[PDB]
Amino acid sequence: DDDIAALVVDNGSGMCKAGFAGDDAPRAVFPSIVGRPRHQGVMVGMGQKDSYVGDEAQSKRGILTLKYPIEHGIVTNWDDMEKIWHHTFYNELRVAPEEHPVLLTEAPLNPKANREKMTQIMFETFNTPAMYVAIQAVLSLYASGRTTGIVMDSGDGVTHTVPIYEGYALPHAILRLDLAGRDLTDYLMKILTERGYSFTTTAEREIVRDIKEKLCYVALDFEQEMATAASSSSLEKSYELPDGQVITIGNERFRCPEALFQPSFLGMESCGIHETTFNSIMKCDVDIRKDLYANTVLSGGTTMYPGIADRMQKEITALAPSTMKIKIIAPPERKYSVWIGGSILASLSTFQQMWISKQEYDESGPSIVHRKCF
Amino acid sequence: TNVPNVYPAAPQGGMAALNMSLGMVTPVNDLRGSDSIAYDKGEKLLRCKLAALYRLADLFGWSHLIYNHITTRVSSEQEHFLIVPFGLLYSEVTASSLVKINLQGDVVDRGSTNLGVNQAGFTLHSAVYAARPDVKCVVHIHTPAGAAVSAMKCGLLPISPEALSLGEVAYHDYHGILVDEEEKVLIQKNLGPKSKVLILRNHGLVSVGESVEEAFYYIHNLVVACEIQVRTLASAGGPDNLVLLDPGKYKAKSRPPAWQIGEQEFEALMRMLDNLGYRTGYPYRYPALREKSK
Amino acid sequence: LRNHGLVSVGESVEEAFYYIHNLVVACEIQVRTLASAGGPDNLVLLDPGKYKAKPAWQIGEQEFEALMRMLDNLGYRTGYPYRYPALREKSKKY
Amino acid sequence: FSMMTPINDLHTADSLNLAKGERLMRCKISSVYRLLDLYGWAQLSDTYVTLRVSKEQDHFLISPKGVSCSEVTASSLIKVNILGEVVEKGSSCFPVDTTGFCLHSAIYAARPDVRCIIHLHTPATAAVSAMKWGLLPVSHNALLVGDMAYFDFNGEMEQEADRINLQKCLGPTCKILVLRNHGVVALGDTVEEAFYKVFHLQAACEIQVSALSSAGGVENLILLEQEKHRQKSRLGEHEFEALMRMLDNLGYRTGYPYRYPLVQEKTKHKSEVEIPATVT
């Protein structure tokens, strides 16, 4: 407590954040990538590792095959996650894992074996004293100052909407949808090939992601905006590539995020995000509908596109009943909020009963996490 | 999971599936353990039972909008009858939405809803409540077959063993004037000292019971016997074409975890309604339908 | 067919469905109408002659197409050829 | 897997030419279609409910031909004239037929105090229409209906003289018309009163059919005398709000405005560290 602070480690699908509990800012945020060399190294004395992890891997993008250990919110390479956790504990923070508790976040709906494997890895090798698993979407509402409301989360893995009612996650009304930032980046490639610019390797995917981050916005009205873009060239902007070339994105700036609202562009038969949130509220009982319409919180990396707030408000107004209290509450720091909620939750004195001791794990195997943490 | 938000409707009678889809959302056991300075365990249990009875009455179609009322007794030391507030549909009724009023209609508990109760509609139940200290549950129902049975001169006929199980039927003629206190006196006269089933002519069918299960049993038997009579009295056209069962001979020959005489159908339909997802919280006589696997 | 049932013949599927639907709605008219009608009394009759004397789909196509629109909303996946694919037009140029 | 369609399509349309109170009447008659579809009375479009928008401008709203009552929405309604000319067409790519409006047109020419006319073709009401002495008030609901007028119907009213006989047989003050062999017509100043009377007369007809079947004669029944039978809420105001509220709870986007709030909405438990809400 006083002597040692619990480690708050947020394992997002695209980025990984780490810091100490009770602190405002995470100490280290880095991409969750692992790269392996693809070319023969002929310089004898310059020093080449077998694999590069994190920011060191992203510095040398040209000579590596970048691989993501987390795929669609599901871990597909567990020793790769051992590497990313080793890099987090030893290099970024320079603290031993055996002397501090750790806090882990997770998707609202994950397989049981995934939780068991995380617990087994965290106790067996790192020998951490105490650990706890929390739902990613719950901690955002704690960071919001709220205990009742609907939380929409969208990262690089998957986009899900949950309702929370005085700290209770309703399991039936949690809805999932496969519209993440990675799919938007792939669609950005697919629409960039029209102008004449071709990107094909995993190195250029980071360039396309940076283009998506820096030059995109959400149209309030799609049909008017297409006519506006066809009429004039005032919407066009120029981006300057790492090799010195200059591209003109032009029309596609409001075509990249539009796959969120109309998933038929990507070939998916599912409904839009607004319909997903509307159906998520529709599945709950009547009594809590009024405080779900009157209380909506946006979170996640994808939700920082400019103009997403007004478009979201209009699209959820179009589906809501008449004279209904509708408001969207989007904090400016909405994709650092999960770490903030984790540090807040670890800061409390009544939270210290949540910790799982080493003796408890040694007695009850890796299956104790589900009984101890509901 | 994998279930539509609203259930797809039949070619006829969309009210059944529609109220099913509404009951999927709204639980009838609205109470979850909040503060209740006036509620009792028996009062809360009877509130749940009454809400479930309202939803079951809506589910069979034994309902004519909101113009029928069902009242129960809290069985406190003074008055306190529970009634639906005036205005809410039967599929909208929850446990906390029910309104406790006095015998003359004064609202002692306004409930969870702003809608007041109908003052004129409670006098018919108040006449029965003042008539008998034994009665505890009064159900007023309107089915077209029952209205057709009430509209004929002869009334109910002993043609089925279920009508024989009904026993003596009190008949109340349609005054249509609502003359208040003497109307109450005439109800007391026509109902008599002991009776199970009342038929208020050309308007509706009334069942009175010491319990909810008894009233449900009586009104179910009455409705089914009425719709038995509808077809056969139509096809007969006279006494020369109809066989009448002898009441006395048939009744003489025919006659704790143990069930009452009317708890079986109530518990079976409560099992059905909880399998639907209404989560009524009714105390079952046996918690499981079958033995647990070994 | 006396004491057996009903048969409707038609040039097309939609017309035959139209004829059989008109016949069955006629029979539930007649069954609940003729209950209290005793002989010529208690009955109202219409002369067929003077009442009969009194895109562009024919009879039953509107009927059967509306029922197919009802069926396709249930996920039946019928593939009936609709003259009009949607009730609303496409959105304008804006 | 669902029939559920949002009954309010006024925001997505953002077009057409509307009156100052038209967009509420459109939603109200669309809801009337939804209720008559849900009870199983009608499924196939035969121009059942007609509403007058304004006393002076006429421009009566009707359903398009070809759209079943389940699929009718607010923007799909068509504003026609008294003769049958198209005043305004909504977003409904269907051929326009105003033949069924002719039944309501002379009633519009006869009584102005009516705005809503509801025509039925249910088997019970059509059997009562073929029932030669008409509705016998042997039940309470038939007493609640009121007085009736009976009119012979030859199936056509394009003729100039048939209109005179129709408005002669309707009378100065009578809000229920019974056409022989052609079902029933109900007449109301508001859609609420007309819908209430439709429901009550349908229930009375359903009672009467079973009664005439079971009794086998008039003498086996009892008939109470019409002379013996002989804040403020309007005739259909109270029930129709409950129906709209229940459809809102299911999820139909009913645009009907509620005169009084449902729930008290006790103030929830507030924290100061809230981010201030809304997107402004």
Ligand SMILES: Nc1ncnc2c1ncn2[C@@H]1O[C@H](COP(=O)(O)OP(=O)(O)O)[C@@H](O)[C@H]1O
């Ligand atoms: N400033 C920004 N502008 C636009 N998009 C951003 C911005 N920052 C992050 N993103 C998008 O968010 C994604 C990262 O989401 P992240 O918050 O890491 O997900 P998780 O919740 O799994 O941690 C990236 O793919 C990126 O496209």
